[PDB]
Amino acid sequence: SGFRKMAFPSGKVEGCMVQVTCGTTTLNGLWLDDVVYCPRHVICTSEDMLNPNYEDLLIRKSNHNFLVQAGNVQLRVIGHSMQNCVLKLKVDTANPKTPKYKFVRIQPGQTFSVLACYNGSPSGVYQCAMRPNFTIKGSFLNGSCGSVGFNIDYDCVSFCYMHNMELPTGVHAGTDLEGNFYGPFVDRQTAQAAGTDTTITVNVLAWLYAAVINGDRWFLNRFTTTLNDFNLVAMKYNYEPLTQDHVDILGPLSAQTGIAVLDMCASLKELLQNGMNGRTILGSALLEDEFTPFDVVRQCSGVT
Amino acid sequence: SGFRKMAFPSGKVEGCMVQVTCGTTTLNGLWLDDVVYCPRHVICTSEDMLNPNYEDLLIRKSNHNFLVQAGNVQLRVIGHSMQNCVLKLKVDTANPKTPKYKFVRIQPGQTFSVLACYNGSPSGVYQCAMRPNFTIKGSFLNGSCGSVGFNIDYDCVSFCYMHNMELPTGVHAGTDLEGNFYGPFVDRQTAQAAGTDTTITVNVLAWLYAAVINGDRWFLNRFTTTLNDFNLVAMKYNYEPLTQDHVDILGPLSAQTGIAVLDMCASLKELLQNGMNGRTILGSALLEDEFTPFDVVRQCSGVT
């Protein structure tokens, strides 16, 4: 029993982290086959960062201007190209620790593990959701850029995130491994707005299922509701509208617990309308939306 | 910016996990040099578990009765010994992936990362505190025993925990790597009581410091207090009494933020006496006690 914000084991990603230095700027790179991926803003001086012309800045750089270091080992750069907001440095050496991997553009509401790195060395690992407004609630200091978010599927590492910047609200923004930002953000040191941040309804429901499975049942009420009725209440509280697809995804959890999704919806509506009255669910005094239905079933069936 | 429940990178511990099978029972083992460590209750049948005589049960077992598997690789067992509640299986092969390591008996209030495993394969990683009552609030299913808790100090893995059992309250109990239980627990399937579970005051203070550092300052009040006065209020709310040692440990955080420990104590007293009035601190609606002062300074200075 017990339910915990659980990260993927980080060993296969640790083996891909390198240090990328261009002039004074140092951040983390991802070393897969003979290509090192990092944020293109490694080429910026603190001045460039206010409104950089990446095209013009990159032209003053050649392969020898990119210092790539794995442990104490200095890699030889034999090619450089800019793809959106990612720099790809061709190196003479294929990473002998390259896991089986894919690049995936993850959907809002899905989760992933962040391996927070500095100077190409791992610091720690934590689970994040891609929020509806394409930000994450991370822990990132200077030097953390190039740190990556990933899922593991048995042997296959799926990289989905590369850390780039912190917004004025203190939340975090980054790119997929093709260098395309999640959300409307650009890699320049200007004030940038994430949209209103809405709660991931299907994830809140999964976590209430997770709680029921763990013997927290107090919030279970005598009521039911419909999607429209519930969605009226969802809109009021900035919850994402629930859909039959969301119901279908919860099916396994519904069928395991024997609690109809719309009954759980009625429970959530009363939680949302009355608060928790100083009570807690799975050791939290707020409704948690950073667990997917998959996250719940993995942790509850002991997937490795 | 940002503050997250962060686990250590798990790569060095992943390389030490093996599968130990005795008869039908399978759990995880830790493979360091030519010794595999696992819970001695691997030798129990479901019947034995109610009141096992480990001495008599172990005597019916020889080296060939211990099936040790690393990946698809079957290790040869050339020796077995019981040390408290741990079985040490001597194997013919030294683990070529053995990290630099120590066995440490960790203090209550200190934190560690758990690499949750099944069949010797990693499932995920999360941070736990050893509670004052020598239990942890984990996520552990059947097969999870042998899963270990550890800290990393640069190159050195410090193993402190090996998972053994879940108590009726749904919290978790285990041994150090010498097989000595944390707390009054024994490895038998009987009802066992952890003591009253008290809050780790020094950790709550570190986290309020963590919050101030992250721009959450609302709870900062105009009051101060003394240790005795504060400790009167601590006893009332089942907080561990605060000591000059605890103050000295917070010194760095106090000196960084410019907020006296006793002023922060006065803030905590009002939080404890008035609750949070529906407000949140670092995205929590409860006072968090599973961050040590070290945890806060590591995450805030980007230690790797």
Ligand SMILES: *[C@H](O)[C@H](C[C@@H]1CCNC1=O)NC(=O)[C@H](CC(C)C)NC(=O)OCc1ccccc1
């Ligand atoms: C990459 O290492 C860095 C990560 C920032 C630093 C502090 N917390 C983060 O997430 N990214 C940047 O510095 C980024 C570079 C621009 C070219 C996009 N700029 C940025 O994030 O500005 C906001 C900020 C900078 C420094 C401290 C706090 C916030």
Ligand SMILES: *[C@H](O)[C@H](C[C@@H]1CCNC1=O)NC(=O)[C@H](CC(C)C)NC(=O)OCc1ccccc1
């Ligand atoms: C080790 O794999 C297992 C871990 C339990 C299983 C479910 N959650 C856990 O932490 N440990 C035991 O099964 C342990 C063996 C005794 C000889 C100590 N017994 C135990 O934990 O009893 C409580 C329990 C058993 C099964 C399910 C739920 C609770």
